[PDB]
Amino acid sequence: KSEIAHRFNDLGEKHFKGLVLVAFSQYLQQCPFEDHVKLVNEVTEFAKKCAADESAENCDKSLHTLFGDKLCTVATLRATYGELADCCEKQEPERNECFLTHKDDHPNLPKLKPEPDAQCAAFQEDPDKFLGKYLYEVARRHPYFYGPELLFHAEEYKADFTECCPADDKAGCLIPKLDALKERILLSSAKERLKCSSFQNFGERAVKAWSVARLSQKFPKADFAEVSKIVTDLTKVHKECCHGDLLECADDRADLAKYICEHQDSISGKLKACCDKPLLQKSHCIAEVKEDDLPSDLPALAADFAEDKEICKHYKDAKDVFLGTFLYEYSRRHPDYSVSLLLRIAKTYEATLEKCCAEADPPACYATVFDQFTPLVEEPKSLVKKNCDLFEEVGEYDFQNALIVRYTKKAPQVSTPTLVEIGRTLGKVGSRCCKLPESERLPCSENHLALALNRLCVLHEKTPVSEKITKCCTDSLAERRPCFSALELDEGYVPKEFKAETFTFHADICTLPEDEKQIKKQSALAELVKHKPKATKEQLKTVLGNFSAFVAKCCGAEDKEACFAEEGPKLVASSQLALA
Template sequence: SEEGASIAQRFAQLQEDNFRAIAIVMFAQYVQGGSFGQAVRMAEEVTALARSCAAGASDNPECLKPLDRIFLDTICQEEDLPWLSECCAKEDPERHSCLLSLKNSSRAFTSPFDSTNAEAVCKNYSQSPQPLTAHFLYEVSRQRPFLYVPTILAGAARYEETLKSCCRGTGAPTPDPGECFQRQAPKVVKPIKEDGLRQEHTCGILEKFGERTLQALKLAQISQKFPRADFGTVSKLVLDVAAMHRACCRGATLDCMSAREKILHFVCSHQAILSSKIQQCCEKPLLQRSECIISAENDDKPAGLSPHIRDFIEDKGICQQFAQEKDKHLARFLYEYARRHPEFSAQMLLRIGKGYEELLKECCRSGAPESCCRRGEEELKKHIYETESVMKSSCDIYKEKGDYYFQNELLLSFTKKMPQLTSAELIKFTKQMTTIGSKCCQLSQEKLLPCAEESLDLVLGEICRRHLRDPINPGVCHCCSSSYSFRRPCLGKLEIDESFVPLSLTPGLFTFPEDLCTNQEEKLQQRKQEMLITLIKYKPQISQAQLASVTAAFATMREQCCRQSSPGACFQTQGPELIKRSEKLLSA
């Protein structure tokens, strides 16, 4: 669609149901404090206008207004939204920027599923399904005011599927709709959460490290995905994608959608020069295309691609090129390197690009660039080896120890690095890292690095955003703000946080409740992990041997007490004994 498609064109292109759904999303995202009734009323008003414009009411001046303006005017004409009056008094584009600045994404995400009230939900669904879907759109959109529209619409479609399958009358297939809702809810909620996280992640990179870093990341990713495309085409895509993220991260819903659409149109109409792997994606309905293209596999490398890019190291005119067009020269290097190496992660490619830039800075000063640049190859091999061996050794530990013990290793390491995090946060982040182990460690060597480092990057991004909200410690601060591509190696090298004052041994620090005897494995593991975290916060310098002794002593006591008729009483006498013995052991 061209810049500023008219409301009639949009209506014809999207069809009424999609148009109305997008209008509800738009109003709920812009007016988070508005009621469901207000969002639906505004959406109906705009949909009615669109319908009449599409039917040829060409004499109505409203039909000629840009779509953005129609939406914002509708918001500003709505009664009972006093907190918007200050923004609404301004002229565009200030009015738009002002409304965007009111968007607040810090609310907790509550699932739009009501499994306690499932019978009533199903009754409503059987009478009229439309309002339930509209309510889902409204709830998700006001909780996630920056989330991409297609993500929300895809969630709503999955929600409808769930209602259909869980509410099939109270006959035999699903006698208990509440239980069915609980079972099906993750299918609906998980993609919304994951997409939201990915988007926050990208916006976090843009905000913290700026447009140049985001462009470099996209250049690496697009060059890997479309290795046959020429540099000019890839550069155009990179600039368009970065501009799209700028609009989306501002929360400009319509600009974000139309920028995305233009990119999809370009990609799908240039398949011949881009990729042979996206034909099926391009045949899908518009709103499902981008998700499909993002997860499509990389195209095959072109047949005659030389394995090395010697010109970037051996060419005589290299220093002159670097001096004249620094960014373009570095971008070409990154493009040529990335399209040859689908087995590297994008973050590693950025580190290699950074290394190349440092190398040129140094070598072009030295007067003998050729011999100097050859030394760079040694550095490069070393870096590749280091990254690959970190991932390989992590996977070896994972394969040897399994989920629970691997997570405990991570807890030991991360509690020392970031003792300021709560137990719940430490367990959550290390659990996510353990899931990466289960997902990536079984892959072939050429898929391992992209899988592991890209996924890890998301978790570390979340830790860094948590640090921005509520600072953790100086070490984390340094790693989260100095360089995007070196964030993982930097956080990996952190040792014990010296600024942390260890917890003191108060009577309530270690408690041994009766539920340690539970036979629910998961609950017990969480209890033990919470105790492990407290132990490390109390003795950050604890050695592996000391930890093993304390753990063994605890296991023995737990076994003894859980065999007793009243475990609680046993823990009350044995617990303090264990603490005394451990204290002695730890001070040795």
């Protein structure tokens, strides 16, 4: 009858408002905070009016009609959101689609600087407005951020300030917490972005396949009914969120967490803790829940998936249920494999049955299918061993550098700041994953890689620079990582013209905290490869060694700039000779 009254009644005012603020923030990233609050308050007002007389004027309209209408009262300002104003001339669903198409994945807004004194005051004059502003700042930086999850993170941001503002040393309590919160936001956005991109680029099947694999790993005692259903509902949840239907997304998410906790014993022992919790914390806990123990009754698989006479029949009748079942069985027993590996393994099973079921004598053809998996397993296992050995030997910073060189050689057309971000991010994956118990390293490493590579692909969607990057980003979700891995130095590239000033340092660097000095040197590293792309990893290491020495010397001088001005250019010329 009235959809806006329904969702208002289901969600409650705080959540309704949060979710609407998040939605507007993602659709209209460039819009000031003030306009968004008015916009939310007005829509919220309308909802209440609709909740008490659902037959009032326009209470029967769809949400996207109401929300778009509303957005379009402010977005018409061409000055401030150019493209988006032509979205406003379209009726739904074209209009929504247009808005989605024009979301910015890299608006490059000012970095979020915690300010413990001024923020604690804001927190106290008006906490709801202060929370709203976190939602605003995060949402607009991350326009496919999981909606309801951002609300949960807003409760943690509040918790942080509630525990720190009254205490004596504010920044001491408060800054590490907020830096840790920022990890979790970055990582979570990257997780959700991967979901929406898989919808965009590959469709629903790709998402279900991914979800079946991962949910089976997580809930290996659940039988296939439970997994299947969960997958069906979680896919529908994320579909709705990716498509900007936040309110509907949050209702369906609540329904699902309720189901999962009513069927706790038939899904996983580990959900106990998650289920004796409130809505948002509950949902969150389920979504990040540890993997359950393996059951003692897992079936032999070969008996059914290799040896059985009746496979081609069991497969032609309902290939996706049959494959799903294969995928579920292989996945529940292999928490030690990455999700993408499990999918390569299933595409290989599928491929093998297409071949063998269209052949004279099929069973003799597919009797060795499980033997075709051994090489798919061994490649990433060894890749992870190798990256983890290198990381443990030399550490985060030099490991990042090595990846900066790897990726700059594969894609020297990418902008320096992006290649630095990638390499740094991937080194951070090294620090997360390589310390884990050995069987957990493959999945930690590839699943995180998938996210970083998707970030790079998304950036490439808006600023394309390399056919190689396009080729890897679009061929196939399962084949992404191995495809990036196989890129070798782009031989087409003409070395970037030497600009001495790029490699020339100054005293200003001396102020910077360690990790921003690092970024500057690593930028220079990427630029070093751009100009000398055949230089080996170790020539670059030595030259970078000499750069670091020199920065450290000159930063410790009486006259820092005289030291830089004198030595800097000698270093810059000589280091070109060292990269032949």
